[PDB]
Design a protein around this nucleic acid. Sequence first.
RNA 1: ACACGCAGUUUUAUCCGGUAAAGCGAAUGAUUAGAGGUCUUGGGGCCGAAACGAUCUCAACCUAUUCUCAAACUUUAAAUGGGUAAGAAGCCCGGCUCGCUGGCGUGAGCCGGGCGUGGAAUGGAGUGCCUAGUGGGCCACUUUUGGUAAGCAGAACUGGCGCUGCGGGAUGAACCGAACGCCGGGUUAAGGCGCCCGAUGCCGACGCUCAUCAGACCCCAGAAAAGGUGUUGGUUGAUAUAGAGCCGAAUCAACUAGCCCUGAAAAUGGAUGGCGCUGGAGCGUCGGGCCCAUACCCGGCCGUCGCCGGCAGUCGAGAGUGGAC
RNA 2: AAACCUCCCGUGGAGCAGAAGGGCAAAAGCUCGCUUGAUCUUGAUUUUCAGUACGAAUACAGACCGUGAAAGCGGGGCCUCA
RNA 3: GUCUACGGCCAUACCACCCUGAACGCGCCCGAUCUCGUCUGAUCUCGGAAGCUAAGCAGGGUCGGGCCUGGUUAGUACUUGGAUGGGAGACCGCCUGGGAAUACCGGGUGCUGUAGGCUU
Lengths: 187, 75, 168, 159, 175
Amino acid sequence: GVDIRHNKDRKVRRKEPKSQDIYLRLLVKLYRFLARRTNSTFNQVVLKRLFMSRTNRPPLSLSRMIRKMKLPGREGKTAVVVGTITDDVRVQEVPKLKVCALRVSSRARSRILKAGGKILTFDQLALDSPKGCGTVLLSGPRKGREVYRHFGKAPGTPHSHTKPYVRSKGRKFERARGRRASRGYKN
Amino acid sequence: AKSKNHTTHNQSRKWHRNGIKKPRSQRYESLKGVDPKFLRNMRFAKKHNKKGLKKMQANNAKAMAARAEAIKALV
Amino acid sequence: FYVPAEPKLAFVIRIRGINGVSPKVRKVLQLLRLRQIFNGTFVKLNKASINMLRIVEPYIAWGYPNLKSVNELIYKRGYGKINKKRIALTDNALIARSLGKYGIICMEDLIHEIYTVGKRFKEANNFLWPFKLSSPRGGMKKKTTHFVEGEDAGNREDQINRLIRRMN
Amino acid sequence: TNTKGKRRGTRYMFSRPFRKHGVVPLATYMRIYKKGDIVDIKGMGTVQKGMPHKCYHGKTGRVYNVTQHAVGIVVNKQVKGKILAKRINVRIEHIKHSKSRDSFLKRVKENDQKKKEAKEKGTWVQLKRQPAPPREAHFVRTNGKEPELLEPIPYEFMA
Amino acid sequence: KASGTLREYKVVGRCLPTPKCRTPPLYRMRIFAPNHVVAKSRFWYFVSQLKKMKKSSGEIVYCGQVFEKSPLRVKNFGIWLRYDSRSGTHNMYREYRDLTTAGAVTQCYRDMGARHRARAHSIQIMKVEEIAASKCRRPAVKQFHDSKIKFPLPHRVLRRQHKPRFTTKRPNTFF
RNA sequence: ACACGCAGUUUUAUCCGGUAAAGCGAAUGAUUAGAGGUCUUGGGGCCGAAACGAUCUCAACCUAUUCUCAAACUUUAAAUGGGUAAGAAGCCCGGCUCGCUGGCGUGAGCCGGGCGUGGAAUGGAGUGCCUAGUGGGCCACUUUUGGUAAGCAGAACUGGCGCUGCGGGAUGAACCGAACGCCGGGUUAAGGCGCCCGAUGCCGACGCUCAUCAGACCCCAGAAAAGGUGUUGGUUGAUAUAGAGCCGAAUCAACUAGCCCUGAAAAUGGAUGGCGCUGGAGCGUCGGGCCCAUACCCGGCCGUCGCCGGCAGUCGAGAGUGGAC
RNA sequence: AAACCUCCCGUGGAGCAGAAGGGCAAAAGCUCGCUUGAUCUUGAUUUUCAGUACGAAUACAGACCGUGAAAGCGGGGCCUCA
RNA sequence: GUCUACGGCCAUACCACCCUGAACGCGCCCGAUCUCGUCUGAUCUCGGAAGCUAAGCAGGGUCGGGCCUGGUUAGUACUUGGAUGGGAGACCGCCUGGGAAUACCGGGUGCUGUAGGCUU
Ligand SMILES: [Mg+2]
Ligand SMILES: [Mg+2]
Ligand SMILES: [Mg+2]
Ligand SMILES: [Mg+2]
């Protein structure tokens, strides 16, 4: 008889990708070997992000990647993204960059190749930089999805700015008793 | 059909099951709830911090030079 | 008269189960690495530890161990906590790998640190997994009452050695 | 059931002690309370304005706001599931400095002194506190006189 | 408190020294206990009952067993008792005949438990003194004060009733 | 070979309370009785036309005492308990900003620089989404309200049953021990060792007790006041060789505590579990030895969890190099 | 014995509208003189709390004021409900 | 040694009675034209320096009351945790720790900040 709680003994973190596509499985096997053998933690982070779901690796915009590469010191380094590189249309000047990503949009691929940059896959990254030396690891905005605007403190609560679940926004659908000082009260 | 009115018998176990937490203290607490005049003065002070920045830069450079000279004198 | 020094080392054995335990008593017991019955551990004696042992007097039986007691406990039932795993101390290599930075390289150093509590008593004691002692051979006197009144619970300053011999 | 009155059950809590009624001493009115000062709240029945609630009596908090004759204190309060760090406005008469932090400040200053000193000496000094150790075995000298016997006293009914 | 074959312990203790009282006085007591661990507890109980001294505020200076000076001589021991009944407490004086003082105290405990249903925790031992043949009040002790003492064993009920259990001969009680 | 942060814990400091207790010779309220008071006035009365002239008495009061109380009283005042602090988000300097406050000053906010184990012991932590069932409870130690009481109704803390098997209490919700994968060996807890029924088939120890209603183990399954020279101990008090007519050595009285006895009456035949037990198999205090639970220790097997686990094929056990030239 | 005047003692044993508790003595009581802060407007917080409303309250701030020599005090009732 | 003005802690500072006050100072005290307010220059306000410690005030004394601080009460009352402890219960003892309050008996009877005087 030993008094130990078993409610938090099984950890919930992912061990393998839930997708059944085979190319991702091959990349997972390659980076499993690299992470379990090489002492580099970059391979561990890449493996963990490869295990992640669609919402856990949001797409990275071209403008954000350019701005991140604009920082001093990280010049002539390979961009590593485990998500998708998406074209940004409200930017004009695109420099030459070395990018590694699972997916690159056709517009983004064309603009990157036009500027003289290079686009590589993760199997090419393993051949080029097996330990991930001289690379900048980036990711998209995790809180970019519209679901997080509905998360947090409940609406109708003081000092809360959470979007309620409404069928349609309008004059007579909300903003009444509970939100108007003239109608009962407001929070 | 009278029933039980009120009790607090099993509540302590429920409270202590999910690790009753001291509120999470975070650095740089918010300024909500402070008198408006003091906040207005602080905002005006921060608004003009950029003014006279070259004086701060020159003083910092002079202090750095003095510190380097003192380090060299010590060595 | 020569008043001997207050002992700095104590050995604590939990002598009752895990049913119907007070929250404070169970908190003290789990802070002492004593969760299963008949588990033993070494406790460094000071004001805070003395009060903690006073809280859980009915649940523990403790005393002042000898050199032979610590020798047998560390040798026969000595297990080290390596990588959060219970590993038997079958070689000095494990003890060195764990406590080399503290000058502990052999079981003799562990015995010296435990019996003669020094600067690194905390790390050496925490390295040792809590002892899994067997049931006391020859039976007990009375589990439910204090040692002063003929029972087993409480402080048995010199008589803890007999209990160790009958349990180890 | 009990009423929801604000001052219910404060018959003795918000009451001046024996032979200490009358004019409030002026020392409490002229003590400063900077931001980040640890303060323990004790209500006073003489002043009715700025009265803290009965649940904050005896609690200790930190000052975050200051007004002309009142300060804002953040005090932890447990409500049946958790501890809430909530801010209240309390007048000065119900506010006094807490002496728990001054001992720590004094020990910090002493430790800084012991760090600056004995550094060129080379001998490291013990800065951490320790609990009460064993009683440092010694000798007891019963010079001449023998120990006195203490026999139990026979019982007798006194009532 | 339990009882076994008790031993006599001499316990010396004092309150912890203080700047107000640099040299506190030393106190000693006669404690009959199965072991020294419970002897210290009984000493502290009695001292706290008499003086303003507690275990935390004091210390044990010397604890040691008192050996019988003449184990080979038969002596008469007078014991003054202080025990609690179902009703109020009472004071008693009892006499026992034994070779050792500790044996006399054990006999006193056994006799008190047998005759008055009094447990050990309810009994306080005040004074134990050896007495000569005279000054004995109890005739049970006095009847053995005879140089030419004679008595046979009239009814010797045999033991070993379960040593070989079935026998053709009935036992004998006259020897 | 290399730890931040958190705790139904304690320690060292520093605040909070008004319950237990105690007091009413201190406040409020209740309340007993004597001494000194025409303090004050008044009723019956007695010596007096009357008279504070003598004597008491009953009225509410006083002066120093005295007996007893308060959940809705209190000068005092615990144990238990409730907040904080035990450092990097901390200190020590230099300089800027301010439509705030100010005689100079404050106060706050911005930048630059220098100083790291901050009491004990134990834990890896933090954070975000969906989310079923539940929303009749009950019992027990302790505190406690109403009621004569209740296996009654109603509260506080903790632990259980509910949702839980196992050993013991013969029987069994909640009691004692102890919590569950399938097994072998050993040892225990609580309980026991005349037979049922495993184990005292000890050459057990010391005492008590006779019941024509004996007694025999928390919950628990039954008894009170009052009595007994029945018996066994303790306390106090006297007298007795100056003798408690004869015999002759110790004697009496009042209390007190154990066992037993009277008090002690209900309905189918009846239950220390039964048989039975009295040099106990009863009662009190106690020694060894022994009996076994799914508990503990060692070992085999099954599964789950964790290993920043290992293997795409290499040197290698405190790793603290290897290799050109 | 109780009409009004004078002196002394008087820790509040009075009064503060109400039920009770707390608090108050050159007051928070009584008498006077002036007034309508019982005015207009953003927020923050406290009580029950789910930490939602209503009511009640607490510190502020921005204007118009009242009062006093001034410091200051006052955006209803000394506070706990109406 | 001490006083005045403004204070801090608010009786070790209060209350009752008695004795002593050298100098400065604090007041009593002398009047109501001007300022001011009353039934009354009693209070307040104003104008002064003929007398005084009479009083306030300051210091000291009371086998003083009170107040503050100790011993006793007392390891008593009470109380955390424990028992298959006792008892029909009411209740009580023990183990492990903490630990009171009356009556009664001792000691003491204001310290101190700023500025300005006197004793030169
Ligand atoms: Mg249990
Ligand atoms: Mg009481
Ligand atoms: Mg159900
Ligand atoms: Mg305003």
